[PDB]
């Protein structure tokens, strides 16, 4: 495997999304993961509506809209409805509305979605490198994270108790520092223009690598 990875350098990764005061991060993840696969077998990149999910993929999936969701149920929503609206045709609102999917708007479709065993960073890694940016929770409820800027984040009081959802786009090491690079969704403010460099290898640090799925065209 390759020491780093890196998809934004392979054009799969669209731009950084902000989701407003509707936590609809785990729509966000879902869609991410899904655009690069739709890079990869069409040649396009094209931004997918999360929005579509979170007016969609509700009840029958276990999912809250801006309260909350899964990126698996996601997918399996997405596989059920066969195909997803795109952004510019469904876009996003920051608020639960009612669900107003249509196939002429369809940019993509999924036919099955992957779940990693729990917490094995090393197969996480094999993932990103091998299938493409992976879906994943994290801890995201400390002061520190809000503030992060720079650097490799690690933080002490990090549980494996995930409630965000965020995608990974790659992994590296800085400064002797392994990290995942994580794609979040609270717009170019945050961190590194959207992205923070999470701990690789440091205990499922923040249980990055607690609940990991990746979907396939
Ligand atoms: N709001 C908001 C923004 N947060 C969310 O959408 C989070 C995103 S997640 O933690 O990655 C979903 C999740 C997946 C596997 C195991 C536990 C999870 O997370 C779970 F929280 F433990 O989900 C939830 O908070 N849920 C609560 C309601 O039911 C759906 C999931």
């Known amino acids: 495997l390759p020491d780093s990875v890196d998809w934004r350098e392979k054009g799969c990764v669209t731009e950084v999304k902000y989701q407003g005061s509707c936590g609809a991060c785990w729509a966000f993840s879902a869609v991410g993961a899904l655009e690069a696969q ?5 040649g396009k990149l094209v931004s997918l509506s999360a929005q579509n999910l979170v007016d969609c993929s509700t009840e029958k999936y276990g999912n809250k809209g801006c309260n909350g969701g899964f990126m698996t149920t996601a997918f399996q929503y997405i596989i059920d409805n066969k195909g997803i609206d795109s952004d510019a045709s469904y876009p996003y609102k920051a608020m639960d ?11 993509a479709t999924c036919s099955k979605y992957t779940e990693l ?18 879906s994943v929770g994290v801890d995201a409820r400390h002061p520190s994270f809000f503030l992060y800027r720079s650097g490799v984040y690690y933080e002490p009081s990090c549980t494996q108790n995930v409630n965000h959802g965020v995608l990974v786009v790659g992994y590296g090491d800085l400064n002797g520092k ?17 992205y923070i460099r999470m701990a690789r290898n440091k205990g499922n640090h923040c249980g990055i690598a607690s609940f990991p799925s990746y979907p396939e065209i």
């Open 38 to 42: 739709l890079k990869l077998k069409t």
């Open 97 to 107: 509305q009612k669900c107003q999917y249509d196939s002429k708007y369809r940019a």
């Open 117 to 134: 065993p729990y917490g094995r960073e090393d197969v996480l890694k094999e993932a990103v490198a091998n299938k493409g940016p992976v």
């Open 178 to 194: 392994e990290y995942w690079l994580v794609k979040n969704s609270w717009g170019h403010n945050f961190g590194e223009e959207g």
